[PDB]
RNA sequence: GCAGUCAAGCGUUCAUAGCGACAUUGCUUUUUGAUUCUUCGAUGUCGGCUCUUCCUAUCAUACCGAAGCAGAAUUCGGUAAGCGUUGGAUUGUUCACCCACUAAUAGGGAACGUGAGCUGGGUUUAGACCGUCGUGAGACAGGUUAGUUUUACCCUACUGAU
RNA sequence: AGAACUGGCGAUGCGGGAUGAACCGAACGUAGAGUUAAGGUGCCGGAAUACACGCUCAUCAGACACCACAAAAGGUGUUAG
């Protein structure tokens, strides 16, 4: 109904510096630097002090206000990404055919290889996005760990691994074979 | 593997189905996301295996 | 050829369209075979299905034992009068057209074949090769 | 002819996997009627053959969702007309009915596409036969047999050529 | 297809509805000036890309009587009650 004013608060810890100009957000922390372009929302940022940043929408409708809270979450994820990081844990689920997963190098592209999924002869490869590191945890059976500063890069990279192992022409209720995200958390 | 079977069932079995366009939906959804059926609220749970 | 064939066959010039009558080279009691269809044939307007050496056809016995007549049965062509080219560059042909009565799996109804048998047919159908005396 | 809404019930339990009574809202012009506006100083009339293109209410092929989807097979639905959709016996047939191959043998439109493109078996001139009807001449959307298919050199369109 | 009252077309141009026998405006000797009707003023096109308060975003939006079509039933789309 064209609300006069809507505000959201963004906190920053001691070790994180945030520079915003012309809707360009650069977050620098102990773990690195993240950047984001937000020239599609029409909001205004202001600085209250060294530990608080406000974002506001003036004379906005229901749909415009709904995107204001999205900005706060996106900026907050950048802040905690450069401080705590993100960790996604995935498990291998199979009934008969073991799933073999290894990191391979192909023309300097840092791929990950999936072999013998449901006995398939086809070789499955998923590119590893920049800034994402992949480790195979010990003392845990069939677990792969993805880490990075960007939550979107880590989450989407893990999503690619789930989609590449979809069963076709079978009852997926019975054939529950694949790799699935089992835990979302932080590096620290 | 009861622990791993539950994890896989969360993505393959714990879903809702639209009664008009058969779209696969979150279990707690109230309306279908598809524009083809006009975001209808007529939904049913996904049938369990046997 | 249908089911029961061992391997594939290089293309051979067709010389036996539907309606052709070929000799029966086995000892099942039939004297000729009247081809009504060709297994694995394609579709084209006005084009007659045609068979060559080694093809499996559907045939009816016109002359022979009474119990073999008035019915449809599969058959395999073993000789061809139409000339065809082999991949070694040789054009060759037989004196007559001949076939043998078989089942859908390719097993022969009879147990003996008179006259020569083409090499392509023998390799495709193991049962024909067993009952054949001279290949080519 | 095709498609919705409602849900008493069918479905071992279980309205809506797949179906669905009693009612009710539409769409289509590939059926047949209703009408009589155009044409009787004439728009060549059934079917087939040949050839091009269009529609999607999709038979097959590509990728998917759903199931009372273990596998195999099948069923319901979505995006999709890009690409295919046949060979024969009987009948003038459209239609129909069988045999067979096939990934499949989906449904339609274009003056019920297409006769100065063909063909002329049917219908629908004059000859002739039969049955029933009529005193009779003759009648029969009943059966049967024989019966002339004309013209492009003009304009445009199209295909090639200066 | 067939009646009732009135107004029209037929017998009638002119401005408007892109286009149209019947609708809207208005009925006609030859000319000049001024003002209007119905309908219009982004460009085609003469005339404000005027003013004011709201509503709507459609991967088939909508756009002006006669008139060149759309319904039952639905949507935590958005708005008001
Ligand atoms: Cl009479
Ligand atoms: Mg004339
Ligand atoms: Mg003409
Ligand atoms: Mg004429
Ligand atoms: Mg016609
Ligand atoms: Mg003619
Ligand atoms: Mg013509
Ligand atoms: Mg003509
Ligand atoms: Mg005739
Ligand atoms: Mg006559
Ligand atoms: Mg009248
Ligand atoms: Mg008059
Ligand atoms: Mg108009
Ligand atoms: Mg102007
Ligand atoms: Zn839906």
């Amino acid at each position: 109904m064209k609300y006069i004013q809507t505000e959201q608060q963004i906190e920053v810890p001691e070790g994180v510096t945030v520079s915003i100009k012309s809707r360009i957000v650069k977050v620098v922390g102990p773990r690195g630097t993240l950047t984001k372009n937000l020239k599609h929302i029409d909001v205004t940022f202001t600085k209250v002090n060294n530990q608080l940043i406000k974002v506001a929408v003036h004379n906005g409708g229901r749909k415009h206000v709904a995107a204001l809270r999205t900005v706060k979450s996106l900026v907050d994820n950048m802040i905690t990404g450069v401080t705590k990081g993100y960790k996604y844990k995935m498990r291998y689920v199979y009934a008969h055919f073991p799933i073999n997963v290894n990191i391979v190098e192909k023309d300097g592209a840092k791929f990950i290889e999936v072999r013998n999924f449901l006995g398939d002869k086809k070789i499955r490869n998923v590119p590893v996005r920049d800034g994402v590191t992949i480790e195979f945890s010990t003392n845990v059976k069939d677990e792969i760990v993805l880490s990075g500063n960007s939550v979107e890069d880590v989450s989407q990279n893990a999503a690619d691994l789930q989609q590449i192992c979809r069963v076709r022409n079978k009852d997926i209720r019975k054939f529950l074979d694949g790799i699935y995200v089992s835990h979302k958390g932080f590096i620290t | 593997e009861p622990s791993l079977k539950a994890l896989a069932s969360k993505y393959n079995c714990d879903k809702s189905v639209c009664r008009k366009c058969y779209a696969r939906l979150p279990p707690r959804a109230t309306n279908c996301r598809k524009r083809k059926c006009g975001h209808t609220n007529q939904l049913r749970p996904k049938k369990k295996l046997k | 050829s249908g089911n029961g064939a061992q391997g594939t066959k290089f293309r051979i010039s067709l010389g036996l369209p539907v309606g052709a009558i070929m000799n029966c080279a086995d000892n099942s009691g039939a004297r000729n075979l009247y081809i009504i269809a060709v297994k694995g044939s394609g579709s084209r307007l006005n084009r007659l299905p045609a068979a060559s050496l080694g093809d499996m056809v559907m045939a009816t016995v016109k002359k022979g034992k009474p119990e073999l007549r008035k019915k449809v049965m599969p058959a395999i062509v073993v000789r061809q009068a139409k000339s065809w080219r082999r991949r070694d560059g040789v054009f060759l042909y037989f004196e007559d057209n001949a076939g043998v009565i078989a089942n859908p799996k390719g097993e022969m109804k009879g147990s003996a074949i008179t006259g020569p048998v083409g090499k392509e047919c023998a390799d495709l159908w193991p049962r024909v090769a067993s009952n054949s005396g001279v290949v080519v």
Side-chain angles (χ1 to χ4, degrees):
Chain A
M1 62 168 198
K2 276 70 177 184
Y3 301 86
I4 297 179
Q5 180 70 8
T6 309
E7 282 271 15
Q8 297 291 339
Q9 292 183 164
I10 295 175
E11 283 77 1
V12 293
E14 182 65 27
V16 172
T17 166
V18 180
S19 58
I20 304 184
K21 182 175 183 178
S22 188
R23 268 93 55 81
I24 302 296
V25 179
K26 178 180 179 181
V27 182
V28 183
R31 292 185 178 270
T33 299
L34 292 174
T35 181
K36 176 179 293 299
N37 171 85
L38 296 172
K39 280 183 171 62
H40 57 85
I41 316 177
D42 287 323
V43 302
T44 169
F45 290 95
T46 176
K47 179 183 182 180
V48 176
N49 52 31
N50 294 265
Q51 290 76 219
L52 182 62
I53 293 184
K54 297 265 195 172
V55 60
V57 169
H58 303 282
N59 194 33
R62 174 178 177 82
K63 203 68 74 171
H64 190 182
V65 166
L68 178 57
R69 173 69 183 192
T70 307
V71 182
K72 171 182 175 298
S73 298
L74 264 49
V75 173
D76 285 4
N77 288 338
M78 301 179 65
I79 293 177
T80 178
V82 302
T83 295
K84 302 181 182 179
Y86 282 95
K87 278 183 54 176
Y88 274 54
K89 296 178 173 300
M90 311 179 70
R91 302 296 298 275
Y92 308 151
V93 184
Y94 59 87
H96 189 268
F97 298 98
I99 306 178
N100 183 26
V101 182
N102 298 279
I103 299 292
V104 298
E105 196 79 11
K106 186 179 65 65
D107 299 321
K110 195 66 175 184
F111 275 90
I112 179 182
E113 191 178 31
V114 181
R115 290 180 178 262
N116 196 38
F117 179 80
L118 284 172
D120 286 329
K121 258 58 181 179
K122 179 190 179 60
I123 297 301
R124 290 172 171 87
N125 301 98
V126 176
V128 176
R129 300 186 187 274
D130 197 359
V132 179
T133 168
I134 290 183
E135 297 176 353
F136 298 88
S137 66
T138 180
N139 77 86
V140 181
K141 177 185 175 185
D142 303 326
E143 189 184 34
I144 173 181
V145 181
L146 296 84
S147 298
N149 289 10
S150 179
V151 53
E152 178 58 35
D153 286 326
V154 171
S155 59
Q156 186 55 76
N157 194 21
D160 302 326
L161 191 56
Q162 292 187 151
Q163 301 290 276
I164 207 64
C165 293
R166 282 175 292 182
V167 184
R168 298 305 185 188
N169 306 326
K170 290 297 183 300
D171 196 330
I172 64 173
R173 305 176 305 180
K174 180 68 177 62
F175 292 84
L176 295 161
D177 305 294
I179 309 176
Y180 307 96
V181 171
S182 58
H183 184 71
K184 303 178 182 180
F186 314 108
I187 301 180
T188 296
Chain B
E1 49 280 351
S3 181
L4 295 183
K5 190 180 180 65
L7 179 65
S9 297
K10 189 172 68 66
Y11 296 96
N12 297 16
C13 301
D14 308 356
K15 297 294 182 179
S16 296
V17 181
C18 183
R19 289 183 176 275
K20 295 186 180 182
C21 68
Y22 302 93
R24 188 185 300 169
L25 300 178
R28 286 170 58 258
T30 66
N31 292 85
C32 186
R33 58 166 60 97
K34 303 301 180 178
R35 181 184 166 181
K36 55 172 60 179
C37 61
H39 305 276
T40 184
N41 48 15
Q42 300 180 4
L43 313 180
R44 65 169 178 87
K46 199 171 187 298
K47 294 182 179 295
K48 301 304 177 182
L49 176 61
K50 302 183 181 181
Chain C
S1 69
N3 293 330
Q6 304 296 85
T8 60
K9 185 184 66 178
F10 203 80
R11 188 181 192 273
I12 296 177
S13 298
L14 312 179
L16 287 316
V18 172
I21 298 178
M22 63 182 178
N23 299 320
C24 203
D26 60 20
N27 54 7
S28 61
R31 296 188 297 266
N32 55 12
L33 300 173
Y34 169 78
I35 296 177
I36 72 174
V38 184
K39 294 290 298 184
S41 62
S43 296
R44 170 65 197 203
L45 186 70
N46 305 137
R47 181 175 296 170
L48 300 184
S52 60
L53 172 65
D55 283 359
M56 170 167 289
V57 306
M58 305 308 299
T60 64
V61 174
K62 296 298 185 182
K63 301 173 61 178
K65 301 295 183 179
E67 78 274 2
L68 292 177
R69 294 186 54 186
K70 291 179 159 295
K71 53 186 59 181
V72 182
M73 59 192 66
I76 298 177
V77 178
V78 300
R79 287 196 293 271
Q80 168 178 328
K82 172 63 184 177
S83 184
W84 80 93
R85 178 191 178 269
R86 290 186 172 177
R87 275 187 282 190
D88 55 7
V90 172
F91 291 81
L92 75 163
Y93 65 104
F94 286 93
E95 192 174 2
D96 70 324
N97 303 287
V100 291
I101 297 174
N103 60 4
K105 293 180 178 180
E107 302 165 337
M108 291 186 56
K109 188 178 183 65
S111 59
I113 305 175
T114 167
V117 176
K119 178 183 180 59
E120 293 82 354
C121 184
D123 296 326
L124 190 60
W125 301 99
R127 295 305 92 196
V128 177
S130 300
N131 302 17
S132 63
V134 178
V135 179
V136 183

